C-alpha cells in the first residue's frame, strides 16, 4: 500500500519545489530592488502555515501545490503611506516590472540548470557502447574488427557511451584517412583496430554504424554469475556466486547469451549443467521457472558477473554547462511539441530528472502570451515600447581562461 503513499509524497514535494521556487524568484527579485512584497502564497486550498516576517511579508502556504502567487502593492489592490510608497509596484518603473515578471519563470529554468548540475556532478548510468555484430563485406569488416567487444575509445577520444562513440566516430570521418579504435574483446587486453575510411565518402540513406559495419547490442561475457536471488530458482539449484558454467545438457557453451538462450527457453524443464567452482567441474541441476511478465520466457534469477553500464563523473562547471545545455534542449523539445498542437537509472536521480523536466515545463508554459501569467505580462511589456559590460565581462573570462590554462601547463616525459 506504500505505492499510493510514496507516489504521492513524491508527486507533492516536486509540485512544492517547483511552485516554492517559482514564487521564491518572484520574492527574490522583488526584494532585492526595494519592491517590497506583500503576500507569498504558495498552494490552493485551507492555508495551514503563515508567517510574517520582520518587513511584513505574510508566507502563506497550502496543501493542493497547484500554482502560487506574490501579491506586491497596488493602489488599487491596497494603499500604503509615505513611508512605503516608492516601494509599491505599479510605482515603481516599468523598467523593473520586466525583471519582475520574468523571475519566476527563468527560476525554474535555473532549479533545472542546478537538478541537472547535481546529477551530472554526482554520476549517471549509461550503457556501454558494446558491438555485438560486425557486418560482413564492409569497411570494419576488411579490418577484421573483433565481433562482441566494448568500444573504449575513438581516435584516443575516450567513450563511455553509446552518443560519445557516435560522435567521436562522426567528427574524425571525413577530417582525415583512417580511424583508430580502442576496443576490449572479451578474456582478452584492450586492442586498437585500424579503419581505412579514405574511399568511402557518404551514405545519402543508410545508419552510419551500418555504413562502416557496427552494429550494437546487449554486453556480453562469461557465463559467471555475479548476483543469486533468494528462493531463486538457481538458489535451489545450487548455483552460487563465482561460478562459471562450463557446459547446458552436454553442449558446451561459451557466452552469457547461450546460456540466457537455454535458460528463457526451456521453463519447467530440468536443465543438468556443468559448473567451473573453484577450480573444479561440478555437476548441477536446475529447473527454469515461468516469467511472471511472460510463461514462455525461462526464469532462473541470476545476474551476469561482468558488468553492463557505465558511469560519467563530471566536475563543476564542466557540469552545469551540460546542466544549461540539457535544459536547451528540454526547451526545444516542449517546443516542438507544442508545435504539434498547432535506460534503467539508479535510484532518486531519475525523480530530480523528472523534477528538472516538469521544472522546464512550468517555466516554459507560464511564460507564454496567456490571460494571466507572467508571460503573458512579458508580452503585455514587450508590445508597449551596459555594453561596456558587456564587452568587459567576456575580456574578463577570456583571460581567466588564459591563466587558468598557464597555470595548468605547468602545476597541472615518454
Ligand atoms: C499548474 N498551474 C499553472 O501553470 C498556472 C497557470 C496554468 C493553469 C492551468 C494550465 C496551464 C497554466 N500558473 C501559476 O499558477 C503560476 C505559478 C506557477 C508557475 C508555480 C502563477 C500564475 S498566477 C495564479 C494562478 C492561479 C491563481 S493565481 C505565477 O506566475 N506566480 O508568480
Ligand atoms: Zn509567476
Redesign the pocket.
Known amino acids: 500500500m506504500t505505492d499510493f503513499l510514496y507516489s504521492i509524497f513524491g508527486l507533492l514535494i516536486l509540485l512544492g519545489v517547483?511552485?516554492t521556487f517559482?514564487?521564491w524568484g518572484?520574492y527574490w527579485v522583488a526584494k532585492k530592488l526595494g519592491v517590497k512584497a506583500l503576500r507569498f502564497s504558495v498552494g490552493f486550498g485551507k492555508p495551514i502555515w503563515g508567517r510574517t516576517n520582520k518587513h511584513g511579508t505574510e508566507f502563506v502556504i497550502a496543501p493542493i501545490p497547484?500554482?502560487?502567487?506574490?501579491r506586491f502593492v497596488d493602489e488599487r489592490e491596497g494603499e500604503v503611506a509615505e513611508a512605503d510608497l516608492p516601494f509599491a509596484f505599479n510605482r515603481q518603473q516599468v523598467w523593473k516590472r520586466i525583471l519582475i515578471v520574468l523571475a519566476?519563470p527563468m527560476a525554474?529554468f535555473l532549479l533545472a540548470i542546478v537538478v541537472y548540475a547535481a546529477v551530472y556532478m554526482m554520476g549517471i548510468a549509461v550503457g556501454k557502447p558494446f558491438v555485438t555484430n560486425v557486418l560482413p563485406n564492409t569497411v570494419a569488416a576488411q579490418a577484421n574488427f573483433p565481433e562482441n567487444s566494448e568500444i573504449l575509445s575513438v581516435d584516443g577520444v575516450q567513450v563511455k557511451s553509446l552518443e560519445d562513440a557516435i560522435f567521436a566516430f562522426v567528427d574524425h570521418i571525413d577530417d582525415d584517412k583512417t580511424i583508430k579504435v580502442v576496443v576490449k574483446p572479451l578474456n582478452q587486453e584492450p586492442t586498437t583496430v585500424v579503419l581505412d575510411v579514405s574511399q568511402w565518402q557518404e551514405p545519402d540513406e543508410g545508419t552510419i554504424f551500418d555504413s562502416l559495419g557496427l552494429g550494437f547490442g546487449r554486453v556480453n561475457g562469461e557465463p559467471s554469475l555475479g548476483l543469486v536471488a533468494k528462493d531463486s530458482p538457481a538458489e535451489k539449484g545450487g548455483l552460487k556466486v563465482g561460478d562459471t558454467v562450463v557446459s547446458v545438457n552436454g553442449e558446451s557453451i561459451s557466452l552469457w547469451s547461450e546460456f540466457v538462450s537455454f535458460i528463457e527457453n526451456n521453463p519447467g524443464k530440468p536443465l543438468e549443467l556443468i559448473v567451473a567452482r573453484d577450480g573444479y567441474q561440478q555437476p548441477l541441476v536446475v529447473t527454469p521457472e515461468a516469467n511472471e511478465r511472460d510463461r514462455t520466457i525461462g526464469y532462473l534469477g541470476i545476474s551476469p558477473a561482468f558488468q553492463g553500464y557505465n558511469v560519467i563523473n563530471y566536475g563543476f562547471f564542466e557540469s552545469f554547462g551540460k546542466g544549461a545545455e540539457q535544459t536547451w534542449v528540454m526547451v526545444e523539445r516542449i517546443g516542438s511539441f507544442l508545435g504539434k498542437l498547432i535506460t534503467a537509472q539508479a535510484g532518486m536521480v531519475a525523480f530530480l530528472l523528472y523534477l528538472a523536466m516538469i521544472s522546464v515545463n512550468?517555466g516554459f508554459?507560464?511564460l507564454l502570451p496567456?490571460p494571466?501569467?507572467?508571460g503573458g505580462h512579458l508580452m503585455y511589456y514587450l508590445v508597449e515600447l551596459v555594453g561596456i559590460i558587456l564587452v568587459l565581462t567576456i575580456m574578463a573570462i577570456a583571460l581567466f581562461f588564459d591563466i587558468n590554462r598557464i597555470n595548468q601547463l605547468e602545476s597541472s616525459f615518454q
Open positions: 517547483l511552485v517559482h514564487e518572484h497547484l500554482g502560487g502567487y506574490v519566476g525554474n512550468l508554459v507560464n496567456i494571466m501569467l507572467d
